[PDB]
């Protein structure tokens with residue numbers, strides 16, 4: 001619950 | 017006199 | 033403001049290098065899709081006036097008027113930049129640099145002026161970064177660091193910021209930005 | 214310790230690149246004349262064991278024993294490094310960096326470990342710098358900064374120091390070192 | 395004219411969302427250097443590992459201050475004004491001012507960053523929440539009709555009766571991730587976190603003060619009896 | 627260890643200027659003098675401000691700045707195994723005799739990390755940075771002939787001038803102190819007679 005609330009805004013798409 | 021007394025040790029050769 | 037509808041027609045010549053929609057396929061050509069219209073127009077004017085030197089664009093903007101440039105910038109800003117992929121071996125360091133910067137070296141995080149998602153601030157002219165080719169981003173960071181690119185203004189925002197990035201830092205952050213969304 | 218007399222005969226093969234007396238004519242080859250014996254021997258052993266990679270030296274030291282390397286180092290140390298000229302447009306910045314380092318960035322001045330005149334500290338293994346080819350010094354600083362050269366030890370003395378040098382700083386300091394004596 | 399916001403410092407979820415917003419959209423330029431990640435995690439109920447993973451982006455330790463890489467002098471050169479430390483900004487400006495300021499950015503081409511602020515005219519801050527709010531402009535939109543405080547709502551639907559006004563902050567449709575209510579809640583959570591940061595002792599202060607006042611009432615009863623008696 | 631006595635003259639402006647030159651060139655590479663300012667050193671040594679900036683300020687600092695250096699203490703401690711201490715007060719921490727004996731007691735010891743040891747400071751982490759001037763000194767300490775720019779007498783003067791500057795740096799107020807103290811003591815002797823006479827008059 002807290003972890004979802006605190007998710008960083010920037011999402012990075014990584015190879016594999 | 018003081019200028020000679022305080023001359024920096026490192027001497028550098030420069031083009032021209 | 034420019035007209036995206038007419039810019040699409042006017043931007044066909046550009047699509048040779050940047051792609052039809054502005055999503056260039058080659059890493060060395062930057063993606064213009066989704067880039068801030070203000071930033072795109074500023075870059076095009078700088079390249080016209082020689083403030084930014086792009087040899088591949090020699091004479092391509094000289095014949096385009098201010099309204100044509102505005103239309104092209106609006107058309108490219110109306111698109112969506114495709115998101116690349118970050119190198120797993122570099123994503124950690126690049127993410128740390130992008131989100132946190134360097135407290136010790138006093139380098140800002142990129143998330144302030146460029147959004148945490150890398151979309152930039154269109155009104156402020158801060159360019160969209162997320163999804164931009166890693167090669168192009170690394171080249172721009174190197175150019176800012178070495179003073180090759182100086183069209184960031186008298187304040188030298190990016191010249192100063194890139195002065196604090198090493199080559200490994202530049203590569204890692206470019207790789208992270210390539211996959212940032 | 215090595216014998217300079219025998220080293221002269223043993224060092225003839227090296228003179229092809231580094232010069233008969235160790236004062237190389239080509240900028241890319243370092244001058245070995247007047248270099249610290251301890252530093253020369255350390256570099257020779259590092260190149261032998263792969264701690265330092267010199268492709269042009271591949272296999273040249275494999276057949277030379279410890280005593281032969283000591284003799285060559287002693288011979289080269291007995292010589293006097295020739296002094297080049299510094300670029301007038303770079304001598305000011307290079308001199309400033311060499312004598313004062315960077316207070317704000319925390320980069321040391323080079324005059325401590327390398328004498329104010331660049332003669333190094335022979336006993337401590339700090340190499341003689343003054344008069345060394347500007348191109349070679351720039352390459353060494355770049356390798357230290359990029360981690361390409363890591364034979365400076367676990368303390369990473371020169372890697373840490375060169376991490377704080379820019380390309381322009383490296384160029385200016387290399388020119389000054391070339392002119393230094 | 396500021397807009398009132400009812401900020402609940404006992405809402406851990408709201409403060410957590412505000413802290414996330416601050417760490418992502420705000421710490422790029424603004425520091426919270428008078429405040430430690432460890433204390434923020436303890437007060438917001440965030441596990442230390444979770445705080446490290448989710449809110450500490452600068453490589454600092456849990457006990458370190460919320461410092462950022464952007465130096466005040468560099469940022470003053472770049473923006474024309476140094477982004478102030480935001481640990482105490484809720485106390486400096488108040489929560490209502492912050493709530494109105496973060497929702498009052500509107501496009502203004504005459505300005506260096508293309509935006510201006512109703513609350514803070516000619517502010518040097520770029521509109522960094524534009525992706526969330528969307529494009530906001532000084533345009534024409536429907537505003538509730540008011541005549542000398544005679545505010546008209548719809549008796550049946552309970553929604554406002556509106557007339558067009560042509561000098562209002564209007565968000566261009568389909569330009570931001572969040573609608574007006576969602577961005578309102580985002581800004582409310584951010585201002586709640588800032589209010590906590592400015593005064594992290596508020597709840598403990600109220601508890602301790604309640605106990606102190608109870609004790610002082612007890613002691614007053616005894617002292618008053620010892621006075622009125624002994625004055626006979 | 628046994629130290630060599632050196633007579634330090636803090637009124638010798640030329641000697642202190644030579645010592646300041648030696649400190650700026652050979653010592654500020656690793657050591658800071660961060661508790662004194664270039665401006666005050668120039669004023670006390672009789673060095674013009676422009677001359678001080680040109681000849682002794684190598685860090686790009688202003689005349690009024692502390693004599694700071696780029697080498698940070700943590701980095702130097704990592705590199706040398708020991709942090710080069712700030713030398714502003716070293717003449718008070720160690721004394722001029724100890725400094726004079728220490729800077730002349732470096733000899734070659736291959737077992738040491740920097741190839742040198744010191745009689746005064748055994749197993750010291752200092753590289754022998756004045757080896758170019760003194761020459762190769764080996765163990766009783768003897769200098770290998772034709773290995774340094776200076777002979778024993780010329781190097782002793784160089785160390786003496788450097789130690790003299792260090793002596794001044796530790797105590798920049800000594801000359802002004804002895805001047806003021808003379809007048810304070812003269813006044814107190816003058817005041818004592820009046821106080822003594824006043825006491826004698828009353829105690830009759």
Ligand code: HEC
Pocket residue numbers: 143144145415416419420421422423424469473475476477478480483486487492495496516517518519520522523584
């Ligand atoms: C979360 C997105 C943010 C909040 C909340 C605030 N900021 Fe900023 N900011 C920036 C600058 C250059 C200034 C100075 C402008 C000027 O002085 O004219 C500011 C100012 C503020 C203020 C005003 C505080 C006051 O006492 O007047 C507040 C309340 C504030 N900011 C809150 C720059 C930036 C920035 C760089 C791109 C970012 C990412 C943010 N600000 C983010 C937030």
Ligand code: HEC
Pocket residue numbers: 043045046047048049050060061062063064067072073075076085086088089092093096104159168171172
């Ligand atoms: C290949 C011949 C090109 C064509 C045709 C066009 N552009 Fe391009 N452009 C090209 C390169 C190799 C680069 C990168 C230069 C560098 O420093 O690496 C660019 C760059 C731009 C930019 C800057 C983008 C940014 O900074 O994010 C813009 C805004 C731009 N180019 C615009 C543009 C327009 C309007 C064109 C048609 C008129 C066009 N480009 C064609 C190479 C080429």
Ligand code: HEC
Pocket residue numbers: 224226227228229230231241242243244245253254256257266267269270273274285340349352353
């Ligand atoms: C050309 C084929 C070479 C011959 C023959 C020898 N060396 Fe050399 N050396 C060469 C290069 C290109 C370099 C620089 C490598 C780099 O990283 O840029 C060197 C370097 C050295 C060094 C290091 C000197 C220094 O300043 O650190 C030493 C000590 C050295 N080489 C020794 C050496 C000896 C003993 C040789 C004969 C057996 C010899 N070199 C030959 C290229 C060439």
Ligand code: HEC
Pocket residue numbers: 324325326648649652653654655656657702706708709710711713716719720725728729749750751752753755756788
């Ligand atoms: C880096 C190459 C140095 C330069 C150049 C000079 N010094 Fe040094 N110094 C250095 C280190 C690493 C140390 C610590 C050694 C240890 O084992 O602790 C020192 C120490 C001194 C001291 C001792 C002071 C004390 O113990 O309180 C003195 C007196 C001293 N250094 C003097 C000195 C002088 C006069 C120099 C120029 C001639 C000089 N140092 C240069 C590192 C380096």
Ligand code: HEC
Pocket residue numbers: 062074129130140141142143144145146157158159160161164169170172173183184185189190193205472
């Ligand atoms: C504050 C304002 C910052 C921050 C903290 C960073 N950058 Fe960015 N940047 C900024 C501006 C005003 C510009 C425009 C420059 C111009 O007008 O010529 C840029 C541009 C870039 C670019 C070039 C983008 C492109 O050419 O398409 C890059 C690659 C870039 N900036 C990267 C970058 C990184 C990695 C940062 C953190 C280390 C960073 N920036 C921070 C303004 C600002």
Ligand code: HEC
Pocket residue numbers: 243255310311314321322323324325326327338339340341342350353354364365366370371374386705
């Ligand atoms: C003290 C520690 C210093 C500082 C302040 C500087 N250097 Fe120098 N350096 C040092 C060591 C121990 C070594 C040996 C590296 C090894 O064993 O591989 C070096 C070496 C160099 C070299 C290489 C020279 C050559 O290859 O012949 C260069 C070019 C060099 N260092 C340059 C340099 C510069 C420019 C400095 C000031 C910015 C500097 N050093 C400081 C030890 C130390």
